[PDB]
């Protein structure tokens, strides 16, 4: 069994072929705690060993989650973390191959080329043995490893000519990526990561104007003003208040043009480049301004944004 | 293995025979970049080490390419871009005689003699020894160089006589070379390059008649308005209105005219030709008026232009 | 009061008038972040408000300096790191008139006229108000923008006719500009811009032969081992190995080599000029090549290479 694993900062993804050939897809929390979880036998409890530190699931409120840093990925908890995902999938516990996940600047080196030495560390990391009190657990065998953002551009670049080149800007909640790609993912170019860059831009410059509460409650509003900002009659039904409105607008414009303007200079430092393609949660964001920016015919621009999977189901594609 | 080269400004095309007898032709791009391209092992990439300095082969959009100067020709990447052509040309790895380019006004100095300095720099160029990441290199041996333009009108010299002198006038996108040449090849009387002048006197002013973009897209369209200029009901139904059209003509119109003026003042620093050759992608722009202005006659005038690989087959036929 | 101000992209340079006559100097970083800075009243902080968003100065490492792109010029940082620099200048708050710059390549359009949008856009930059935590800020009244490279070579052209024409050779540390300029700064005939060739091209091919690490101290090794290259003596005192002073005098003098030919290379695409002057951090390293090269006469002949401030004093010298 080969099973596809996007082990993110705030939650891990598999997909994975069946007997048959049905696809199959799991996400599964990255809360966990270094310690013992009691259970007087009335609630499911997961208890781990892995190098010598015991370790157990913490389940959190779904609106808690704890987003994870770089070395988070060469951590204990990871491994446990991929461990318990499998085990709560559905899949017969067994030996797997599986291949996983780097950040962009983790996976590549300032020279653009893999760094190997981050890559064989992240392999090793899963050659941990692992324990479960109260049944097994799966084996893990052989270990691949994938750089993040690229992957969800692979169904454009399959079609594209080895001699093309593709420009994949990745905006997320708080983090860009961005790589030039040849075509049929035959090399990498260039790659560039910013780690202060993100959607929260906006949303925090939202909240901010509102004085909405820390709650993630605050946040789905914000999310909401930000989707509809150009219907003011979606508006003046959510914030009551003709004066708060204006506020919140320009606000919002005024964190929406910096995102633009710092995503377009960063986008300066690449060049050669003969297709586009925006993703990430941020992408329709810059949309507009990245397809003005670039000059880039419309059948040389892509907007694939679909789903959560598209990392992991790319993954899939290239490795199945 | 003898391989002939046109190291030009927008690319390298090679011509060789095989063991046979086939002849075989190849292109290869131009496009490097000084660093180290990285590769996650997805897609093929050339890294390259030659004196010292690394490169790499950059592949970009075939709409994108750059054209090189004169000091290219002289330069570690114009080595890198030649053993590129030899790796990609089906040819096998090995030792390897080959013939290059120099402009004309390179290749021949103000005095109309050959530049022994220059060429012997060209020559020297090619002793740099080169290395590739992952597979081996072909080895030049001795290098032959050739001037430009003059190769291409070899088939009509070869039936002339060594007393008759041949007039080779080659106009091409962004220049113009001029040399007479003593029937068979015998000689050089006189040579001429404008680095100023070409089509795209006559391409922009029609560019800018219809403001089109900068896009290449722009530049086709420039280049069949120009080919079908006498042909109105192609235009009509190209350019979308009966102003446009009146507008784009006589831009175009005034701009042949300015061509054509430059272009004989130029010849008329020649003299003493019998026969008269009009070569290069602006020849048929000009054809008529040196055909009048020469008042040469019918089976003393040619027009020889087949293909791209002209330059390099004519080198084939002199030195094969 | 006038401020001329050379906001480039590794720090900011004031240079102004007081009452009596005295000419003041000022360079200022350009460190800033998207947030505010806490201080529990024990550290100077300065907390920014420009359209929107915060910022706040960022002090850092004089060996961390970040290297900003084009599109910086067009933010709220260079905004907010101007103001700064006022700020701590020693000026008295007040309103003040302004010049500022653009790269070459964005002062000028490939048609070598200013490009009025870029200037415009620049302009409205400085019309943003900016507020400080805890104290008042300058007023920016009237702005007007210079071209980066030329005013350095103003002293040099007020002596030279109208009818002369300079080519201003200034390479840098990471990159290219030459300029043909009118006597007396009467006219600009050309503009040229190279951003990928500078003198980090033998400063790396040094700190990679000698295995150097990635600190600013290997820096100024290889910027020493640069400078003294023609001491060996200096060398052995420095290098302690016989092996390892071969090895990086030769990659050095290979590195060198290449960064001549493809500075001429340029250069071959500019004609007409009278007289040339090279500036610049790595003037010294293509002077002799191009003096060779362009074969001028030495009182036709200028390197006024003198400090830092030789752009902003340029332009106070213009505009004063």
Known sequence: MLVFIDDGSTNIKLQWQESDGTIKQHISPNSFKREWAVSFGDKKVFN????????????????????????????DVNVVAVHHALLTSGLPVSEVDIVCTLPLTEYYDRNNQPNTENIERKKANFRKKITLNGGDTFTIKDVKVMPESIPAGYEVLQELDELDSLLIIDLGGTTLDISQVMGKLSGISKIYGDSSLGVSLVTSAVKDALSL?????????????????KDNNYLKQRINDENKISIVT?????????????????????????????????????????????????????KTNNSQYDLVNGMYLIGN
């Open 48 to 75: 781990y060993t892995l190098n010598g530190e015991q370790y157990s699931f913490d389940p959190i409120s779904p609106d808690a989650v704890v987003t994870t840093n770089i070395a988070w990925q060469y951590s």
């Open 213 to 229: 509460a820390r709650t993630k409650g605050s946040s789905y509003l914000a999310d909401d003003i930000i989707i509809h900002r």
């Open 250 to 302: 320009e606000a919002m414009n005024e964190a929406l043009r910096k995102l633009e303007q710092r995503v377009l200079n960063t986008l300066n430092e690449f060049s050669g480049y003969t297709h586009v393609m925006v993703i990430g949660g941020g992408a329709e964001l810059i949309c507009d301004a990245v397809k003005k920016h670039t000059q880039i015919r419309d059948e040389r621009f892509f």
